[PDB]
Amino acid sequence: MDIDPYKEFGATVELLSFLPSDFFPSVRDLLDTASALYREALESPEHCSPHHTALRQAILCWGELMTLATWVGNNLDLVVNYVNTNMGLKIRQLLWFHISCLTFGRETVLEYLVSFGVWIRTPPAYRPPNAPILSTLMDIDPYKEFGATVELLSFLPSDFFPSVRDLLDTASALYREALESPEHCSPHHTALRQAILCWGELMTLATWVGNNLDLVVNYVNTNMGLKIRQLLWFHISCLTFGRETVLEYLVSFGVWIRTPPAYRPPNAPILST
Amino acid sequence: MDIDPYKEFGATVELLSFLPSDFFPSVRDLLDTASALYREALESPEHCSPHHTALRQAILCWGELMTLATWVGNNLDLVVNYVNTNMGLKIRQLLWFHISCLTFGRETVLEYLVSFGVWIRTPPAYRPPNAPILSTLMDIDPYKEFGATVELLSFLPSDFFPSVRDLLDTASALYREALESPEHCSPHHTALRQAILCWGELMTLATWVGNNLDLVVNYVNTNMGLKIRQLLWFHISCLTFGRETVLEYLVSFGVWIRTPPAYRPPNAPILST
Amino acid sequence: MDIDPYKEFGATVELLSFLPSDFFPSVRDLLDTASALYREALESPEHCSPHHTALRQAILCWGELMTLATWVGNNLDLVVNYVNTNMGLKIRQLLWFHISCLTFGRETVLEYLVSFGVWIRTPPAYRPPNAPILSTLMDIDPYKEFGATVELLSFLPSDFFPSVRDLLDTASALYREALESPEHCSPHHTALRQAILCWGELMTLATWVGNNLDLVVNYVNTNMGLKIRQLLWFHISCLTFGRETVLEYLVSFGVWIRTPPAYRPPNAPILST
Amino acid sequence: MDIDPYKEFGATVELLSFLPSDFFPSVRDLLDTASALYREALESPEHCSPHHTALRQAILCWGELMTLATWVGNNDLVVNYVNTNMGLKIRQLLWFHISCLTFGRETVLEYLVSFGVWIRTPPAYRPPNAPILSTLMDIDPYKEFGATVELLSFLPSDFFPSVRDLLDTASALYREALESPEHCSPHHTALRQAILCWGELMTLATWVGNVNYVNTNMGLKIRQLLWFHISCLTFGRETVLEYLVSFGVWIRTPPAYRPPNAPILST
């Protein structure tokens, strides 16, 4: 799947390439800006916007990118300036786009990307002195806006969830025409596009540790692979079975696992359509 | 042309990849099932369904794949277990899909491919014991449903028909947006998609004989190439000129060939738009 | 951008590949035909047709292809028979398509390309003697139909205009879905599709001089690169800012350049959205 | 930008090439005819005609040519060059506008055709009387437009762009009407004459260079004329006239009693 993170919001990757690489603030400057203004809505049990759904996933994706980044530094700073060049640059553009579309409006940021493009394409002998400005003058749960918890997702066994290869094959076989659509179509589609993109960022970083500096691939499939297996399984199943069905299946299969085998139905529950 | 055999029926190739490779019955088990239930409608002079059109072509494609398979065995069983691995697997999925969509309904088989996908993605420690089942509890003429015969197509000379390169170039230049469409659009489009796919299966098999074991390419252009040249010419011309025009052109050019040259119009008939 | 020159007119490149390479007349025979019939409308200050817009650009593109062709012959006839084989063949098909669609109607030329395809696919033993015929029995300004001149575009400094890389990046980031559309959508889109295609023809020819016979790339960025930078800048800006705004900006920035710095506003004018 | 001095008046250069070069009266004879008949109108604050406007710039252009010619004779070989090249084109322009003021414009255009028939006739059949036209001074260049020389005298010499930069602004904005066969304004008529007056001034200066003090005496006067008519076409006449008032208050104010930025002409 070639999924654009900006396509459902009316932008593309090449449209945000109009701003230079050093236009964007640091991740600390942007994560402080989100918590200064949207910390009560980014931790709300509501969707509230597609921009809030896409911002919650990018905040959790950077934490998993930085969990792997410090772990390689303990178990081999050459790893961390590669993250700031490749993965952290994509995080900074994605954080900047959603924070400023919340602050200023999505049409305003799309008008501004065009206006800054005309300004930066001007040669410096004819460029105006003032650039265009956009001025109008935190622990997140990935499942909370969908009615679940990390506690309810871990209520099921660790080895219950299918492989990350089988889930990306399922999303490609069933939702490739909608995950690559320029529409939102659901909050499940928004949270699933970011999960597919974030797994590509970690799989880019994990093979870079493997080629340059192979114990890291076992670690990412234990901690970050299990978290992406539950995240892919949750949103795929809520698309094909419904969100209320998957929430009741989590407490049906969970109590069935806890029940002694002599006093439960003999076969495991399953979701079927 | 990248044509999917399942795209007009609401499926794809990656959706039928949910079932494993050894899920599908043998070709003998599936050809007996079609003759046990649909032998009077697969030999009817009617379309009756897009599933019947697509099933008639797959039955004739397997006969031409097995005509070439035994001929290489006489004129070099290493050839026949390559057919069972590559071409015969694609035949078994295609026979299974149309026979079961006729038997059970097309929406039922599409629901079943999803339900079997959830079951096979489950790890075996948590998988239910009973898999999903789909249970609800022969000489074909390729031209007969279109009003022609093999006898009427051979009424024209052998070297009249254009090359297979020129006909695939014509279908690409004129019908690529409709042959790759997810619609049916005609019974001519259904029978033409299978002919383009079947020529790719024979051209895959014929170069495999050429690389591994070059007399085979002369044989496929004599017997199977002439049959695919008339099949491509018939459906392309019926799309651009109309089916009733091509049926009258076959008896106009055919009798003109038989007539002595002193008593016919001096130039050959042609189809023009 | 993969732009087809014929896609907005209902044809494609593979549809005009039905005619052989030596079907098309020479460029002298086609440029004389355009001046014999359409010289007063190809020099008019009007659009008059999408066929007239596309024909004006192809005439100017051949002049810039032949300006570079004779300049290499003075500053290294092996260069000029490469132009007649590769770039001049594309010019001859493009000149033939628009001149005959003006003369005979666009639906007539599209019917004729199919009818000639049936005739040329026929083997010569069965081919009729008479082929299908299409018979019904000059200095251009690129900006004149848009309200500007070459004199008004050179009223701005030479180094004002952005690089040809930045302008093709801007058209890709903002108009790729419409420049590759099968619609016309504007006379600005028609004149911009031909400019992107013509720069590819000159960049193909300029590296062929560089590989086979590197002073030529400096020459094309002085004469032909400056002309394509103003042409790309004009049509991109008229799409995002409006045509009347860019025409007033050309006389605002032009007089501001001429004004002494003590008696003008201190910063250069800019276009902003 | 090639401007025909007679295209807005119904003639061409090729139509006035029917008359020979020695047909035309001397500049002194033509300026006396203008002074005796048209002086209260050629020194009037009115336009009164497009012929009066074109005649005012032609009298003022000959004075700048004679000021340039009498200087380079002090620093008579050049006066035989002025009378052969620049004095001849002034004499055609002075004759044409005096005669279209005296006899009317359609009489002079008809007289040009009739003199061509006479001059093309072989001399055995050409009548002895040539056809003749019988049946009927300190000028300010800005006075007909509401301005004066004194009103524009406050703008410093570095206010104005180059003559090249002013001829490009005229060609990039107004070439379609400066080469038109219409009048379109009195600002277009005066602009046509000033571009041709600079062309006569420049060919004299490049000839005597085979010296460019003309860029502080005559090029400065051309630059204000080129600026005033371009600006009055761009911004309007009343916008330029009230800008010249407000710029003069600013430039008469000493430093430390004025804002450090001059007024800008726009909007």
Please indicate whether, in this complex, the C-beta atoms of B123 and A172 are within 8 angstroms of each other.
no
- Chains in contact with C, where contact requires at least 3 CB pairs less than 8 Å apart: A, B, D
Q: Which residue of C has its CA nearest to D168?
A: C155
Please indicate whether, in this complex, the C-beta atoms of B169 and C123 are within 8 angstroms of each other.
no
Which one-letter DSSP state was computed for residue D49?
A: -
CA distance to A10, A38, A112, A137, C135, per residue, from A108 (Å): 12, 19, 6, 13, 56
Give ∠ CA A228-A64-A69 in degrees, rounded to 5.
Answer: 130
Closest CA–CA distance from residue A268 to any residue of chain B (Å): 5
Closest CA–CA distance from residue C155 to any residue of chain A (Å): 14
User: CB–CB of B86/B204 below 8 Å?
Assistant: yes
Please indicate whether, in this complex, the C-beta atoms of C114 and B174 are within 8 angstroms of each other.
yes
CA distance to A62, B250, B253, C127, per residue, from B157 (Å): 70, 11, 9, 13
Residue D127 burial (CB < 10 Å; 0-12/13-18/19+)?
exposed
Question: Cα dihedral sign for D221, D222, D224, D228?
Answer: positive
Closest CA–CA distance from residue A28 to any residue of chain B (Å): 40
Q: Is C15 on the interface with B (CB under 8 A)?
A: yes
Task: Please indicate whether chains D and A are in contact, defined as at least 3 beta carbon pairs under 8 Å.
Answer: no
Q: Coil, strand, or helix at residue D106? A: helix
User: CB–CB of C260/D159 below 8 Å?
Assistant: yes
Q: Which residue of A has its CA nearest to B16?
A: A173
Helix, strand, coil share (%) of chain D residues, nearest 5: 60, 0, 40
H-helix or E-strand containing C128? none
CA distance to A110, A114, C242, per residue, from C174 (Å): 11, 9, 15
- CA B162, distance to chain mean position in Å, is 20
> Which tokens belong to C201?
């023809």
Please indicate whether, in this complex, the C-beta atoms of B118 and A167 are within 8 angstroms of each other.
no
Task: Please indicate whether chains D and B are in contact, defined as at least 3 beta carbon pairs under 8 Å.
Answer: no
Of B17, B111, B128, the CB nearest to A270: B128
- Chains in contact with B, where contact requires at least 3 CB pairs less than 8 Å apart: A, C
For tokens 């571009």, the residue is: D195
Nearest CA to B172 among A224, C12, C36? C12
User: CB–CB of B191/B57 below 8 Å?
Assistant: yes
> Which tokens belong to B228?
């695919």
Distance between CA atoms of residues D168 and D162, nearest Å? 10
Q: Which residue of B has its CA nearest to C115?
A: B272
Closest CA–CA distance from residue D101 to any residue of chain C (Å): 37
Please indicate whether, in this complex, the C-beta atoms of D169 and C255 are within 8 angstroms of each other.
yes
CA dihedral C185, C191, C196, C197 (to 10 degrees): 100
**What is the number of CB-based contacts under 8 A between chain C and chain D?**
34
Q: How many CA atoms lie within 13 A of A223 on its CB side?
A: 13
Question: Chain A neighbours among B 103-162 (CB < 8 Å)?
Answer: 111, 114-115, 117-119, 121-123, 125-130, 132
> Which residues on C lie below 8 Å from A128 (Cβ)?
267-270
Closest CA–CA distance from residue D161 to any residue of chain C (Å): 6
The string of DSSP codes covering chain A is: ----TTGGGT--TTTTTSS-GGGSPPHHHHHHHHHHHSTTTSSSSS---HHHHHHHHHHHHHHHHHHHHHHHHH---TTHHHIIIIIHHHHHHHHHHHHHHHHH-HHHHHHHHHHHHHHHHS-TTT--SSPP---------TTGGGT--HHHHTTS-GGGSPPHHHHHHHHHHHHHHHHSSSS---HHHHHHHHHHHHHHHHHHHHHHHHHH---HHHHHTTTHHHHHHHHHHHHHHHHHS-HHHHHHHHHHHHHHHHS-GGGS-SS------
Count of beta carbons in the 10 Å neighbourhood of residue C39: 12
Q: Where are the alpha helices (DSSP H) in chain C?
A: 27-37, 50-74, 80-82, 88-104, 106-121, 150-153, 164-179, 187-212, 216-220, 224-240, 243-258
Q: What phi, psi does A134 have (nearest 5°)? A: -95, 5
Of B166, B173, B268, the CB nearest to C126: B268
Please indicate whether, in this complex, the C-beta atoms of B162 and C128 are within 8 angstroms of each other.
no
Distance between CA atoms of residues A47 and A264, nearest Å? 37
Of D161, D173, D175, the CB nearest to C260: D161
Q: Is A169 on the interface with B (CB under 8 A)?
A: yes
A178 CB contacts (<8 Å, ≥6 apart)?
A: A185, A189
Closest CA–CA distance from residue C199 to any residue of chain A (Å): 19
- CA B166, distance to chain mean position in Å, is 19
Q: Which of C249, C257, C259 to mutate to test the interface with D (most CBs of D within 10 A)?
A: C259
User: CB–CB of D244/D151 below 8 Å?
Assistant: yes
Please indicate whether, in this complex, the C-beta atoms of D165 and C254 are within 8 angstroms of each other.
no
> Which tokens belong to B270?
């042609």
Of B167, B269, B273, the CB nearest to C111: B273
Please indicate whether, in this complex, the C-beta atoms of A273 and B14 are within 8 angstroms of each other.
no
Q: How many CA atoms lie within 13 A of A113 on its CB side?
A: 26
Nearest CA to B202 among B222, B182, B175? B222
User: CB–CB of D65/D201 below 8 Å?
Assistant: yes
Of C251, C254, C263, the CB nearest to D159: C263
Distance between CA atoms of residues B27 and B138, nearest Å? 14
Looking at this protein, which amino acid is placed at residue D205?
A
The string of DSSP codes covering C95-118 is: HHHHHHHHHH-HHHHHHHHHHHHH
Closest CA–CA distance from residue C22 to any residue of chain A (Å): 41
Which one-letter DSSP state was computed for residue C7?
A: G
Give ∠ CA D259-D265-D267 in degrees, rounded to 5.
Answer: 120
Closest CA–CA distance from residue B244 to any residue of chain C (Å): 18
Question: SS3 letters for chain B?
Answer: CCCCCCHHHCCCCCCCCCCCHHHCCCHHHHHHHHHHHCCCCCCCCCCCCHHHHHHHHHHHHHHHHHHHHHHHHHCCCCCHHHHHHHHHHHHHHHHHHHHHHHHHCHHHHHHHHHHHHHHHHCCCCCCCCCCCCCCCCCCCCCCHHHCCCHHHHCCCCHHHCCCHHHHHHHHHHHHHHHHCCCCCCCHHHHHHHHHHHHHHHHHHHHHHHHHHCCCHHHHHCCCHHHHHHHHHHHHHHHHHCCHHHHHHHHHHHHHHHHCCHHHCCCCCCCCCC
Of C14, C119, C123, the CB nearest to B160: C123
CA distance to B8, B9, B49, B110, D75, per residue, from B106 (Å): 11, 8, 11, 6, 105
> Which residues on B lie below 8 Å from C115 (Cβ)?
272-273
Greatest alpha-carbon span in chain C: 83
* Residues composing chain A: 273
Count of beta carbons in the 10 Å neighbourhood of residue C11: 19
**What is the number of CB-based contacts under 8 A between chain B and chain C?**
53
Distance between CA atoms of residues A118 and A106, nearest Å? 19
Distance between CA atoms of residues C90 and C3, nearest Å? 14
> Which residues on C lie below 8 Å from B163 (Cβ)?
121
Count of beta carbons in the 10 Å neighbourhood of residue A85: 10
Closest CA–CA distance from residue B11 to any residue of chain A (Å): 9
Q: How many CA atoms lie within 13 A of A1 on its CB side?
A: 29
Greatest alpha-carbon span in chain B: 83
Nearest CA to A204 among A56, A87, A38, A32? A87
Of C258, C263, C264, the CB nearest to D169: C258
Question: SS3 letters for D137-197?
Answer: CCCCCCHHHCCCCCCHHHCCCCCCCCHHHHHHHHHHHHHHHHCCCCCCCHHHHHHHHHHHH
* Residues composing chain D: 267
Buried b (16+ CB within 10 A) or exposed e, D222-249: bbbbbbbbbbbbbeebeebbebbeebbe
Please indicate whether, in this complex, the C-beta atoms of C15 and B172 are within 8 angstroms of each other.
no
Method: cryo-EM
A157 CB contacts (<8 Å, ≥6 apart)?
A: A257, B126
Count of beta carbons in the 10 Å neighbourhood of residue A218: 9
Distance between CA atoms of residues B181 and A259, nearest Å? 51
Q: Which of C160, C240, C273 to mutate to test the interface with A (most CBs of A within 10 A)?
A: C273
Q: Which residue of C has its CA nearest to A113?
A: C273
Closest CA–CA distance from residue C210 to any residue of chain A (Å): 28
Please indicate whether, in this complex, the C-beta atoms of D159 and C251 are within 8 angstroms of each other.
no
A40 CB contacts (<8 Å, ≥6 apart)?
A: none
Q: Which residue of A has its CA nearest to C167?
A: A121
